[PDB]
Design an enzyme around this catalytic site. Structure first.
Site, PDB file in Angstrom:
ATOM      1  CG  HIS A 229      -2.387  -0.243   0.621  1.00 52.33           C
ATOM      2  ND1 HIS A 229      -3.172   0.802   0.168  1.00 52.33           N
ATOM      3  CD2 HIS A 229      -3.040  -1.410   0.412  1.00 52.33           C
ATOM      4  CE1 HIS A 229      -4.292   0.237  -0.261  1.00 52.33           C
ATOM      5  NE2 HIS A 229      -4.252  -1.084  -0.144  1.00 52.33           N
TER       6      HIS A 229
ATOM      7  CG  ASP B 235      -8.304   7.520   7.291  1.00 51.47           C
ATOM      8  OD1 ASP B 235      -8.577   7.756   8.491  1.00 51.47           O
ATOM      9  OD2 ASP B 235      -7.968   8.391   6.480  1.00 51.47           O
TER      10      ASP B 235
ATOM     11  CD  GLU C  67      -9.470  10.903   9.323  1.00 53.45           C
ATOM     12  OE1 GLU C  67      -8.785   9.999   9.843  1.00 53.45           O
ATOM     13  OE2 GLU C  67      -9.847  10.880   8.127  1.00 53.45           O
TER      14      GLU C  67
END
Ligand SMILES: *Cc1cc2c(cc1C)nc1c(=O)[nH]c(=O)nc-1n2C[C@H](O)[C@H](O)[C@H](O)COP(=O)(O)OP(=O)(O)OC[C@H]1O[C@@H](n2cnc3c(N)ncnc32)[C@H](O)[C@@H]1O
Ligand SMILES: COc1ccc(C(N)=O)c(NC(=O)Nc2cc(Cl)cc(Cl)c2)c1
Length: 499
Positions: free
Chosen positions: A72, A136, A250
């Site tokens: 990732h 997240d 956020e």
């Protein structure tokens, strides 16, 4: 390519050289950089990683060794052309997560460096516990996020994931297996946290735990004015002792065209919500919409008590009247929320696409200047796919002795913003425009005297890395020479040339 003697080792049974195996380690989530390794190593244990690193470090022809978590990363950081990619997931053969929750001691969870945060969560919840800070996206490895910092909506309160680690096991670039913490081998401990795999492979992390909540009241609050949006986010991260507050904060920036020419619905917003939001974004001409995303954790609380607590908090804020959007989900559903977004994106063929992503840490004193040049000038008529995150954090929860970099200010302001351009190229032909925007953002910061720090940084020259690490550079270069003298580890980071 690789030395012949490597295939005579006891660990050679765990070396995969077939095109099908190496191709699985030739690209990453970015889908822009392609560089197949000579082999993929599937270690059964951390001692197998030490044996591979030791072999390369003592050989006549040293070869690159790159651990690969979930891949990732988007700039080839986990790739090892001319070398060996270590498939960390192999360490997960058997049980690799141990929770210690005995009465008369501080609880913790020991997790393999290859373990996914979603799997750590599953294991700790059985004991009514959970780590404090989350990215997240939970399908990331423990070692992968700790090599960066690991930021999310709880970091304003507890710091990044690197600030919630008791100790590590690290396989250094010499093949030495070291256990480190604030009290033992602290030089390696501090270096490895946000260290970008440069000092060793994290094979174990002891993560801090707290009592787990059961449910989450989750809100998105719409703003049309960046000054009101930022004042409220800063208010929300600045009253941390008050009983009236969010556990998670956020924010998202939605460009005018991204709303109007966007989907009919999202996993969070219904068609009706989106129709109202599009109306709000065009009442006095076209504007972007700034969303604050807050979450309030709860356990045994009744529905009416949660309603009252949320109301007391929302009543203090200045979002557009009639524009709060609320969900009530389990703690797992909240932490794993992006997994649903991924499901939707994959069904639309919009997940396995290029991700020329850019993440910046911006000083609070320049956040409105940043907004003016980036969102109001450069991107006002842009319609990128993906998402844009924007939220503030507190420097006092970050340990600046760790490798991870945060913005430096003359007035030692405690607040800085994380701004993430998570845009995707639905077609690989959209890549150049996105990369041009990334460079334009960086150029705007340079011209404006806005001294940003890239988060998840990528530079292809030592000059870029020396500017990124600033005051810490000399100590980083010294620790590198000690822990990876042959510069074998994660060479895709492009920080150190091979000596
Ligand atoms: C793709 C993505 C990334 C992401 C995210 C959401 C998505 C969809 N949400 C994030 C968030 O909210 N907050 C945050 O801090 N980061 C977020 N990210 C980024 C992600 O954390 C990083 O990219 C990180 O690298 C995790 O990635 P992963 O486990 O997939 O690792 P990798 O891509 O294969 O490798 C990255 C680099 O680290 C080195 N590496 C990998 N494992 C280790 C270990 N165990 N020890 C030492 N170094 C390691 C690789 O060699 C490479 O250099
Ligand atoms: C790629 O698809 C999506 C969809 C939704 C989100 C979200 N709601 O945060 C999501 N979030 C992220 O990728 N967050 C994240 C990603 C990085 Cl690389 C860094 C940081 Cl601070 C945050 C990604």
């Amino acid at each position: 390519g690789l030395p012949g003697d490597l295939f005579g080792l006891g660990i050679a049974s765990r070396i995969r050289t077939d095109s099908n195996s190496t191709a699985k380690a030739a690209t990453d989530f970015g889908q822009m950089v392609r560089a197949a390794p000579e082999a993929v190593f599937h270690p059964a244990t951390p001692a197998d990683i030490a044996a591979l690193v030791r072999f390369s470090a003592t050989s006549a022809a040293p070869f690159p060794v790159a651990p690969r978590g979930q891949g990732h990363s988007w700039r080839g950081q986990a790739l090892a052309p001319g070398g060996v990619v270590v498939d960390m997931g192999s360490l997960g053969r058997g049980p690799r997560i141990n929770v210690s929750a005995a009465t008369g001691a501080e609880p913790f969870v020991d997790a393999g460096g290859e373990q996914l945060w979603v799997d750590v969560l599953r294991a700790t919840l059985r004991h009514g516990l959970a780590p404090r800070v989350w990215t997240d996206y939970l399908r990331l490895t423990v070692g992968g996020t700790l090599s960066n910092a690991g930021i999310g909506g709880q970091a304003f309160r507890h710091g990044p994931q690197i600030a919630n680690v008791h100790e590590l096991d690290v396989v250094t670039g010499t093949g030495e297996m070291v256990t480190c913490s604030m009290d033992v081998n602290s030089d390696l401990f501090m270096a490895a946290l946000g260290g970008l795999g440069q000092f060793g492979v994290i094979t174990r992390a002891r993560i801090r735990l707290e009592p787990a909540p059961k449910r989450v009241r989750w809100v998105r609050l719409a703003y049309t004015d960046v000054a009101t949006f930022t004042k409220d986010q800063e208010f929300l991260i600045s009253n941390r002792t008050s009983q009236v507050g969010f556990d998670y904060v956020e924010g998202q920036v939605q460009l005018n065209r991204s709303l109007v020419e966007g989907p009919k619905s999202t996993p969070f917003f219904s068609g009706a919500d989106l129709a109202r939001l599009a109306g709000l974004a065009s009442r006095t001409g076209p504007t972007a919409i700034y969303y604050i995303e807050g979450a309030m954790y709860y356990t045994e609380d009744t529905a009416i008590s949660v309603d009252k607590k949320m109301k007391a908090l929302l009543d203090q804020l200045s979002f557009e009247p009639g524009f709060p959007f609320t969900k009530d989900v389990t703690f797992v559903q909240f932490l794993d929320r992006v997994r649903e977004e991924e499901r939707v994106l994959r069904s639309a063929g919009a997940w396995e696409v290029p991700h020329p992503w850019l993440n910046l840490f911006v000083p609070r004193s320049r956040i409105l200047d940043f907004d003016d040049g980036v969102f109001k000038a450069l991107l006002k008529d842009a319609n990128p796919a993906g998402i844009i995150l924007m939220y503030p954090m507190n420097k006092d929860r970050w340990d600046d002795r760790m490798t991870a970099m945060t913005p430096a200010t003359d007035d030692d302001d405690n607040v800085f913003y994380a701004v993430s351009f998570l845009w995707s190229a639905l077609s690989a032909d959209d890549v150049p425009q996105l990369e041009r925007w990334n460079k334009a953002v960086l150029d705007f910061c340079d011209r404006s005297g806005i001294e940003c720090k890239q988060y998840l940084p990528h530079y292809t020259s030592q000059d870029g890395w020396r500017r990124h690490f600033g005051a810490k550079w000399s100590r980083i270069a010294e620790l590198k020479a000690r822990y990876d003298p042959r510069a074998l580890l994660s060479p895709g980071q492009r920080i150190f040339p091979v000596p």
